[PDB]
Structures are given as structure tokens and as C-alpha cells.
Design a protein around this ligand. Sequence first.
Ligand SMILES: *[C@@H]1O[C@H](CO)[C@@H](O)[C@H](O)[C@H]1NC(C)=O
Ligand SMILES: *[C@@H]1O[C@H](CO)[C@@H](O)[C@H](O)[C@H]1NC(C)=O
Ligand SMILES: [Ca+2]
Ligand SMILES: [Ca+2]
Ligand SMILES: [Ca+2]
Ligand SMILES: [Ca+2]
Ligand SMILES: [Ca+2]
Lengths: 301, 157, 146
Amino acid sequence: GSRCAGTVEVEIQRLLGKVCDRGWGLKEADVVCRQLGCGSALKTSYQVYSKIQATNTWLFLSSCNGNETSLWDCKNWQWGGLTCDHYEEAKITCSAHREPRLVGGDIPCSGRVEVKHGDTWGSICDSDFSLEAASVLCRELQCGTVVSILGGAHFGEGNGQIWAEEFQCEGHESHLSLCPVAPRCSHSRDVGVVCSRYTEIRLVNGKTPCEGRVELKTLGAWGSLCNSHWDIEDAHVLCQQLKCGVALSTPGQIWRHMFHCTGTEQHMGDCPVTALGASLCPSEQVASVICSGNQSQTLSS
Amino acid sequence: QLRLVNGGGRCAGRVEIYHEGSWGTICDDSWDLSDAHVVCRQLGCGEAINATGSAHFGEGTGPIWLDEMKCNGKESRIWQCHSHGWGQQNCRHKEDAGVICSEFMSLRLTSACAGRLEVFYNGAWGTVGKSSMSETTVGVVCRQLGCADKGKINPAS
Amino acid sequence: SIPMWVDNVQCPKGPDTLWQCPSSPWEKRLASPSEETWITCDNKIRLQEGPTSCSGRVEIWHGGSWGTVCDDSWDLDDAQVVCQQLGCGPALKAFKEAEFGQGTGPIWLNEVKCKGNESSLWDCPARRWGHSECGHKEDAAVNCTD
Ligand SMILES: *[C@@H]1O[C@H](CO)[C@@H](O)[C@H](O)[C@H]1NC(C)=O
Ligand SMILES: *[C@@H]1O[C@H](CO)[C@@H](O)[C@H](O)[C@H]1NC(C)=O
Ligand SMILES: [Ca+2]
Ligand SMILES: [Ca+2]
Ligand SMILES: [Ca+2]
Ligand SMILES: [Ca+2]
Ligand SMILES: [Ca+2]
């Protein structure tokens, strides 16, 4: 049902055919997705929507490293000459099969749902998107848990093609592509979601991209968060969120947000934050962090 | 099938329709005398005197699968009307439909159960002739009214 | 009277709790009722497209979306709970088949086994907030006392 999912089909000098799934590991599937430009492979199966004609010939792959830019670059691949007797076709479902995104939202992890059907992005009707589908959406975009589903085009109406598909997500799927979907609205009923990772925290004024003064953006204005309650656990989470490993030490307007991270959180959105009624903060007393810079480095108890 | 339950007779009580192995009652919604004429003529009880409802004959236990009756009266089957559906309950047993037909018959003694014999037919009460009134007939009356096994004939008081 | 704790609260988009909204610091000061905050929120339960206030299709709010309750096993007990939560008189009818029009948004509730004495519809035992195959033609409706 999409250009990045289904049974793989190989054509050489105008001949129908497919690939026998002998040793069809995730590496070869990833290679196929990479040469097809559909992200990374997720599942060696698909939801059957069309029918592919059976073919006598087959394509056999001995072994491919996985980093190859195309299937044709894999070492010692045999086209024909054997029979796929006890095996099947190399079914595959790459990521871009259902690649979602959030647009029209002021904060990072909120906006109108727009799932891309391989190449073309499209909105979703508010009646064809449940809590489980939204929860998978927030998870796939590394935006934490879902906070709310806003219907009736809360983030505006998105021009394009509205998908009639209805996602029957179980809730624990890591991608919207893995979710079973049942194909069968108006732009005024476009669905929007709000995830829990709304923090929008970064590091500014540092000699290294993994170092600098802590700045946070709320109310549409970047501000210099200070170290009234900026403990080392907070700095550990910020470095982990920024893919900088762990923290080492903590040396516009000033935001008074108090972050209560336990140190094991992977993002600032997961951290319990308290900003109501927080006391004022000296201008010269602001928060900063120096991250280790080693992504392999991890915290310990 | 079709039957009337808890009306004191065969031609009175809640309307009951049998299908799918169970007996059900009507929702009473738009339950007019025209809708009662067809149910009374189905049983052969003649025309309908009253088209009651709102559990007038009691609370009918059983699924409700008949609502919004628009019978014209001329037809002779309750299920041939403009039924809302076979299972469209959307109602409660506290709103159960019941009918009273012309051929509903009731008996009483007026003067507890000592007095003039009165029979209720065609929606009207009236006396019963004393001619050829055997002791068996008086016994049948008393046993019917549930206050004796026999009885005696008395002069008018 | 009650002293004022916090002032100048500015909630950004994304937090669902007031504790994450930056504002002026906590201060214990006496405040007149003029600068106090009085808020009248609309309850999660509501009826729309009805001749009166307490008649129409049943709609609930959950997860930022105004959903609708399917008319599966939608009897007077469910309507009794809805009317009591709305704050008006006892239910008169529990309509089905989208009596007061097609609802908007998703469907949160279906097959609600209310006992007729629940304070709110959220206490009724049923499969809640999704996993519903009901369409918008099966939207339940409630008719309460004026
Ligand atoms: C039935 O209808 C008659 C008039 O046709 C009326 O006199 C009588 O009171 C009614 N009885 C009931 C129980 O409705
Ligand atoms: C609610 O019920 C009353 C009587 O049961 C009826 O008069 C009224 O029209 C009903 N409201 C509707 C159908 O909106
Ligand atoms: Ca802290
Ligand atoms: Ca009625
Ligand atoms: Ca009805
Ligand atoms: Ca009628
Ligand atoms: Ca119920």
C-alpha cells in the first residue's frame, strides 16, 4: 500500500521477480530501504493491500554487510540459477511507510498531525486518531508521552490531502508504520497532538556545542535559566538530552524554572518542573553546565 | 407470537411479542388506540377500548425490541406496522405498553365478596341473570373471585 | 477572607498543570476580591443541539478533545447519571441513533454500565477513552428535566 512497504520486487532488463528470503536479516532490509530512500527497515513483513504476481525467478543474497549504499553493492549476490523452494519472498516495511511529523505548533513537540505516506504528507481527521495512535506518535518523535489530542484544527488547517486511514494502534508500537491501519473528512477537523517534551532547552555562549550557559524558552521568549535549583542531576539530564553524555560541573531575561530531575531522565520534558511562584534570581547568578562530551559515558548509581 | 400478561384476563395486560426464543414488551412510545386495535384483533378480542402504558399492568421483565408503533388499525398483525426495528429498545420496562380490548372480561361483587354479580364486558359493567343459576355456577364465581369454594343465591337487597 | 499567594501567572503552551507555569514569586499578602481570581469552567459533560439546556447528544471531554458517547446499552440509568452530573432534574429519555445530530470529534465511551446512582459518568464501569468501533451515527443522546 506504499512505496516503502510490501514484498520487495527486483527488475533486471525488464523481468518480473522478487527476492528469496534466505538469510534475510535486518541488515539486508536496511540496505534495501537505504537504496530506496525510505529510512531504516523496521519489520520484515507488511499489511497486505495489493497483490503481486507470482514469478518463477528469484533473487538470492549470500551476505551483505549492512552499510552498503545499495543492494547491488552487496558482495556475491546471485540473480537466478536457484529456486526459492522452502522459503518465501523478502517482505519488508521501511520507516517512511508512515513517517509522521508535527507542524503549526509554537512549542517543539506539539502541532497538527501530518503522516507522510511515503512521499506525500497529509493531515488526519480527528475521528481517525485515538489515544494509542497519538501515544505512538509522541514516542516515535522522541517527545515522551502524549498530553492531549486537540481536534477541530487546533493548530490550523493543513493544505494537502487528508488521509482516510484509521490507525488501530495498540499503544506500545515504536512506530506508526508498525501499527495496523484500516483504510476506508474535512480540513476543519484536522487532528493535533500535544506531547510532554515541551521544554525547548539549549546551551548558549560556549566554546563547544556540548557546553555553555543554560537557556530556556517559554512564553515565546528565550531566557537565561539560573541555578537557584539547578543541581547536578539537572545538568546530567540536559547533557543526556543534548546527546553530550553526562555533566561535569555547574559554574535575555531570567527564567525561574526549578527542575527536579533525578538524573536518570533522558529529556527535560520528563523531568518534573516547578516554575509557579519561584523566587527572583540574581542577574550574575545564572545556570551553566559543562558536559563531558562522551556519548558512550553513562551515569551510575 | 403474541400474548398479554398481567391484565386480569386474556384481552388485557402488557403486550408481549415472541421472537428469538424470548418474550418482549413494547416501548409505549406513540402507543395510540390505533396501535391497540391491531393487537386486539390479532387475538380475536375485537376492538380496543384502552391503550395503556407506562407499566400500567406491571413491570415487564424481558428485552424490549419494539418501539415507535404507527399502526393504522386496519392491518391484522402487530409486527406489520412501522416498527422501529427488531431490537431498538432505547426504552425501559417502566414504560411498558399494555392494552385493554373490547372482549376483555372481568367480574366483581358489589354491595367484601357478598353482593350483586357484576360482569365487565365491552368496557361496561352489568349484572348477570339469575335464571338457571345452579350451585355449580355460583361455586365457579366464588372460586374465581378467590374467597370461597361454594356460594348461595340471595334476594336483592 | 484568604491571603493571596501568587500573582501574574502566565501559563505557556504545553503544560497541563499550573505548577509548570512561570509567574511572580510566592508572597503572602492581603488581597481584595477585585484582584482575586474567580473561574467558572465548563464541566466535561455537556449536551449540544437541544431544544433546552439539558437535552441533546451526550458529549464528554478527555485528552483535550470533545468526544461523544456511543449508544451501546444506553439506557435510562446512563441518562440518570448524565443528568445528575449536569446538575438538572432526572432523565426523561435516553435517545439513541444520533437523535440530536452527528457528534464531532472521536468516540470515548461505549457500553456504559451505569447503575443510575453514579455521581459522574466517569465512575461508570465501561471500556473508556478509545477502543471503540462505534460510528458517529451511533451517538447517544440524553433528555433531562427542564
Ligand atoms: C378506557 O376508555 C374509556 C373511554 O373509551 C374510559 O371511559 C375509561 O376510563 C378508559 N380506561 C382506562 C383504564 O384508560
Ligand atoms: C424530552 O421528553 C419530553 C417528554 O418525555 C418531551 O416533551 C420533549 O420533547 C423531549 N425533548 C426532546 C425530544 O428534545
Ligand atoms: Ca534541581
Ligand atoms: Ca413514551
Ligand atoms: Ca423511542
Ligand atoms: Ca401510533
Ligand atoms: Ca447502560
